Amino acid sequence: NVAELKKSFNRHLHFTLVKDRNVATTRDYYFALAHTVRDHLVGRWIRTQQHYYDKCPKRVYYLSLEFYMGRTLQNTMINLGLQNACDEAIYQLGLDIEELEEIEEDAGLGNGGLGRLAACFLDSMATLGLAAYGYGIRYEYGIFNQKIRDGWQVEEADDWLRYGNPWEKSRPEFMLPVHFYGKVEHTNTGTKWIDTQVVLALPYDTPVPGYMNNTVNTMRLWSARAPGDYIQAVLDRNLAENISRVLYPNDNFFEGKELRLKQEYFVVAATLQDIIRRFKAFDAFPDQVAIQLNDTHPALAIPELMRIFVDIEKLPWSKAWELTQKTFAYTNHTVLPEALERWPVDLVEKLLPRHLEIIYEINQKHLDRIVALFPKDVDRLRRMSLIEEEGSKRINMAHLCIVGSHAVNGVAKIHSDIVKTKVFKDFSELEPDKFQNKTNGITPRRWLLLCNPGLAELIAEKIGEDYVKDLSQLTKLHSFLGDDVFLRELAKVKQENKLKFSQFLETEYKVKINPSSMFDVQVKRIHEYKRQLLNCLHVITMYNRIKKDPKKLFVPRTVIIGGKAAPGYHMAKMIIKLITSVADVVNNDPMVGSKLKVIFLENYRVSLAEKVIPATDLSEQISTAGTEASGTGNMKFMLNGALTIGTMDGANVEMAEEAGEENLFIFGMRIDDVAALDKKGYEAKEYYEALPELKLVIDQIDNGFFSPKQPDLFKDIINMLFYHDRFKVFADYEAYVKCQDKVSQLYMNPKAWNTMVLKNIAASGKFSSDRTIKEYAQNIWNVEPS
Amino acid sequence: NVAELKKSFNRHLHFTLVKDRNVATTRDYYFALAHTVRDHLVGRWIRTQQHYYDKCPKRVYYLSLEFYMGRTLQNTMINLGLQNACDEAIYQLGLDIEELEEIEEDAGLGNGGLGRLAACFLDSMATLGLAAYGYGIRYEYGIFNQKIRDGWQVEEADDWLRYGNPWEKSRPEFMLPVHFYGKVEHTNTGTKWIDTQVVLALPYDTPVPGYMNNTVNTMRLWSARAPGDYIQAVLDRNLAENISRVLYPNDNFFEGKELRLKQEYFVVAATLQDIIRRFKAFDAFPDQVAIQLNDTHPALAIPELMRIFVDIEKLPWSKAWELTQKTFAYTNHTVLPEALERWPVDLVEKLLPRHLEIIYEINQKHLDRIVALFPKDVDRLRRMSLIEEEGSKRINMAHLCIVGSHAVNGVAKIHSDIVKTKVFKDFSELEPDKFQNKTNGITPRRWLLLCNPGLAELIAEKIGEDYVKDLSQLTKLHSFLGDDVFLRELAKVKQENKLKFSQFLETEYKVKINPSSMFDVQVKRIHEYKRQLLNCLHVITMYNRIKKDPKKLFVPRTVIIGGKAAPGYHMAKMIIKLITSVADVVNNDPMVGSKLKVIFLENYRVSLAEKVIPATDLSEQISTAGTEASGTGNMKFMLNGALTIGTMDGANVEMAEEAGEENLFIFGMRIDDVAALDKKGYEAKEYYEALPELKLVIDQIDNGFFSPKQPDLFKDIINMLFYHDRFKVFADYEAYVKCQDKVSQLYMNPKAWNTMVLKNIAASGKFSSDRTIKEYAQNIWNVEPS
């Protein structure tokens, strides 16, 4: 009870932090609390892992280069059902728990959607009581902290481990060596990989508590450690430790840096040896082991498992290749060509010479089969080989992932279809059953219970709390479609969120927020395919309109656009500057006043999403049709009371399917409209003329209305937009703006706006990661939710 | 009590190590025990520091680049009087406490004597209840681990923090910035050091418990942290963190590397700001603050205090210079010229431009005074300036330390005299009272209670335990000079030690130890002035003797020579190889058998000294007269029951004074004999001829009797020995060997050998670091032992 939580807290402050109430810092209080909460995890954690050893159910291994975990304290208190008791204990000790919680750094070991999907999967897998493990890398530095300077993004090192991480547990007894470079030696004993450089891998375990179910799983992250001048030799140990130093900040973009390849083989080698070791405590290996490949990043795992089976375990190739396919499953997360992993055979040859041999082997057996089925289709061979002979020979990691796995899945109906029927038509045709779909999901714990306590409560007061573990239960909120009191209560919750988040924007930015305006938000990583630009074109279009007619009845808006750009992404940085430039001109214009305010949410990250999302009314999901494989921010917003304005793309389609197309503000081109416009040939100049408001928008940008001191500042954008916009911004502008007006129309009718919201929330059940995982478990890993 | 200790232990294993008895590793048990013991320090630690704030007694700041701490567990158990209870609790839990204690890594943040003197001082200062703080650097890597390969020393990184350090406490709220490089601007608002690069200093506190007295002091060690390509920019953060990465492995040798200068200014800047900060919570500054400079390593502290006083606090130079001198005190630790710190004004100018100006200033005021006293003695000026104009201009840090301090002390009568009357005659003549002596000491806790429980007990059973806190009490062991039972008991203790340490040498080295042989040991850092060579010449001389006459009644010996060589010290490495070569030839010779065995104690360090020292009979302290400023290993051996064979050097002289010259085996040249032989001119070839046994020794070395495969392997040694031996090995060989025979003579008479031992142990009271500190407190820091 509260009493014991307070005693424990004091115990830790004293013994663990060596402090008194007269000298304890705010940080000391947070750590003391974390420890107090952390202790409640031990019993179950040991019990859970022990239970997996005893009953030996098939285990699931989620192998990913990223895990966008966020903060742990609160999530752990909720899932353990200790939040209310802790809130009380901390209150009685004269402290502000919210204040202590803010001290915790986000474990931002991910770039965005992909990394966050891994985090939601862990929570779900633990909640469904599955024997699942997350295997990744413990980056000393996660995704950079974003700061805006002179309207531009500046990167600062995210030194999240500086003051310590109470949620991680070093597991020194499981350290393992990883090999790099060296050479292949073909002898009578077989193929040996010798003269390699060694790097030690030290695993760090982090508990993953299921929601109210006694289960605490593990996320094992590996850290790299080192195994002429003496002083300099010691310093060069840093070179080996550089492997797990920092997470590559690219979202949907392939950068073929050697260090990156090292990280990939690193996590792959350590993980597989650790799995093998655990297994031997091989015919039944795939009946006990399931390894999910999160995108092609861990593709090397396939030839590494083979290498272990063949070179170390001495199994015959045929047998080894069979077990491998039954062990792996591959998830495809993108369609953009510049994101595709294609490593130069030269780099791989030098760094992983034995693996290159193995990949060649795989390809040989693979291609021989194709001929043994289509003896004359010559172009089909090169089209299907894991090797791209064009110019400089490179490896198509996706193809390696397809042949080395028994199942390949996309992350949304539309996406999976494109992956199965177009992108990999040749492979799907040969192995029909291999390709599947598994529509993404988000955990309703962090993205509802934790981030929106007001909503969670309102809902539970109307239909009970069964919905937490079975989100489909939300369909019962339909019974309240005509209930005016409930609808007023729904909007009240949304209002409290907006008021709390406003006070946040107030202290952070010198802008007076119209608490009654509509919160128009587009938060996600900055990328042309995501179109923060199109949105920006709209904001500017609204600016002008107010100038021309400042008396016109206008629904006030607070437009929020936030997200980080990859350091080496020039266009994204230009767009950020463009937006901050626009914001300044709009925010300070005397005629616009509290009618329209533009904010660029700085340092958008998981813990910040938990704040802004619940305070949103309008969710911007406007990616060009066919570009966003699925999206998950769209779901978070849907579940949190916001209406969506977007294209029929990724999971947006299924959101319309569930809620009813009429209850979402769909617009612009669809997958086929994009195809047609391609064949014809896109010429942005035409819309620039046919659409008068656009021309004005564009001219102001290019003329320097938003960049006086630098008239041609944004020329790079104009240039791209007019002759190199592979994402057709102008082509959806008319429909987009047209759609936006309608959004404001509905907003004026509170009763109708909230009616549509209710239909959205009541239809979000399908997007719970719990449903996603049950499908993965049943149709891919073949494991049972206990 | 035992019950509670066992409960706590289990609590930590579970909550802190997340383990059960079925899965806990030996490392987990050690950590669980450490935490159990560590908790007993919290109360007193907070109380002690709080007490210093309230009563505000003058504080002592021991500034050192090194703190050779060793292991903490046992020391802490003893000083807190918990060892017996813990031993019991661990036994009842079915564990071996000795086994757990061996898991702990030595905090080898020192090279040898100097670093260990700092560690003994901390223990003593805490035992005397003084308000003392140790300020140093937290090296990620301490002194390298030594391994012997093919008879040669090989260095391995001492990654002591890999598995964590339970004895350190991060103090994030006291982090501070340190500046490097930049340039200077003398504005009308004071001098400004701008455009500097910043490096953050994060302090880590370690508790220093006094022996049975409620006092727990602090040792604050600073770690360096960082405040174009994005990935590479993040990696370059390592460059700043390199500052506190590794301890320079040089013992009595000056290496002018820039990184070293950085470490020095680093610890100096952080320490002084932290002291200033604490003080302001300036006329009374020196009445509250005393900063001891451990050698010239932290010399920069003088101009840094001035810089703070003048450039930041805006005090007038005159006033600032006055407070500075009253604040600092300097301890001189060496006489060898190649060890003297003399930084090139160019390096300092680039890295610390403002400090160079300040040093120039100091020198100016300084030299003006000299002329204002000796208007014509021109050569005296350059002879006394902090600047050496010869060739490339450099700074004499010793001279900076003399003028910036109110007191300078040597570490032994003979040494302090040489420092005051010869080396700094010009300074001592001007400021007579400034130079003092403070003979070194060792703490009787670690070097008696902890390392030799058998002896400590025997002694306490005869005269009580008051001796622990007042070692002079040992003089009472005289009453037992004729007591045969006591003498038999004394030798019994020595025997148990030898048998336990033998089992150690047995498992580590494949050599059968004659448990009844005389343990002849010389353990210390490897250096020509220390003469492991002369010893080696003796071992070889004993080898031959046995060959010529294998029937001769010979007192069996086990010669142990151990120590690390500085990586860049070629001669030292040659000597190590020479010794291992000799050992092999002696250890395997069928005629010598169990008559003589040679061992090269590998990886000699603090925890290892605690093992071998108590097992020693004969302590080798044979440095050339005038080279060893003091020595402390000599004291440890004296206190532990060994007889000493050595020259009248360092503290060896005072050991003879205390015990009676006849009760030590002194020999060879004395300080004056060295002077004479110099003036005349040393010609090693002469002794090579006059001494027949030597010629044989030498010829065997040079001919390849110990290096068949490489006949001229040791030519480098022979060369040095015949034409470049600035330490006159041959000149003391005759006396040395002569002395050695006498040692064996006495050994045959157990009753007489133990009689001399008793006189040694009974006279070691003076060498307690408690006495040394009382003198420092009373005559230098002016603080009162509470």
Ligand SMILES: O=C(N[C@@H](Cc1ccccc1)C(=O)N1CC(C(=O)O)C1)c1cc2cc(Cl)ccc2[nH]1
């Ligand atoms: O480090 C101690 N506690 C730990 C407590 C802790 C552990 C994990 C996360 C947050 C806090 C501590 O303060 N830190 C570990 C972090 C790091 O490695 O940077 C900071 C500690 C308690 C204690 C008590 C005594 Cl008597 C002596 C030394 C001590 N150290």
Ligand SMILES: O=C(N[C@@H](Cc1ccccc1)C(=O)N1CC(C(=O)O)C1)c1cc2cc(Cl)ccc2[nH]1
């Ligand atoms: O780090 C934990 N305990 C600590 C315990 C410890 C602390 C200080 C020195 C030695 C051991 C730990 O195991 N280490 C700190 C060392 C390092 O920094 O490498 C290794 C820990 C306990 C725990 C319990 C739960 Cl439920 C979840 C996470 C957890 N971490």
Ligand SMILES: *Cc1c(COP(=O)(O)O)cnc(C)c1O
């Ligand atoms: C969920 C989430 C994302 C994913 O955004 P999309 O709009 O689906 O690309 C990105 N960043 C954070 C911090 C998230 O929580």
Ligand SMILES: *Cc1c(COP(=O)(O)O)cnc(C)c1O
């Ligand atoms: C005490 C000690 C020293 C000093 O040895 P001397 O022989 O006194 O120079 C050096 N190293 C270690 C590990 C010590 O314990």
Ligand SMILES: CC(=O)N[C@@H]1O[C@H](CO)[C@@H](O)[C@H](O)[C@H]1O
């Ligand atoms: C390569 C990559 O980061 N892919 C991202 O993955 C997430 C999770 O599947 C998708 O929702 C998103 O649309 C997609 O852009």
Ligand SMILES: CC(=O)N[C@@H]1O[C@H](CO)[C@@H](O)[C@H](O)[C@H]1O
């Ligand atoms: C440079 C250096 O390490 N000096 C050493 O200091 C210790 C402690 O004062 C002396 O006992 C020793 O003789 C001397 O060689």
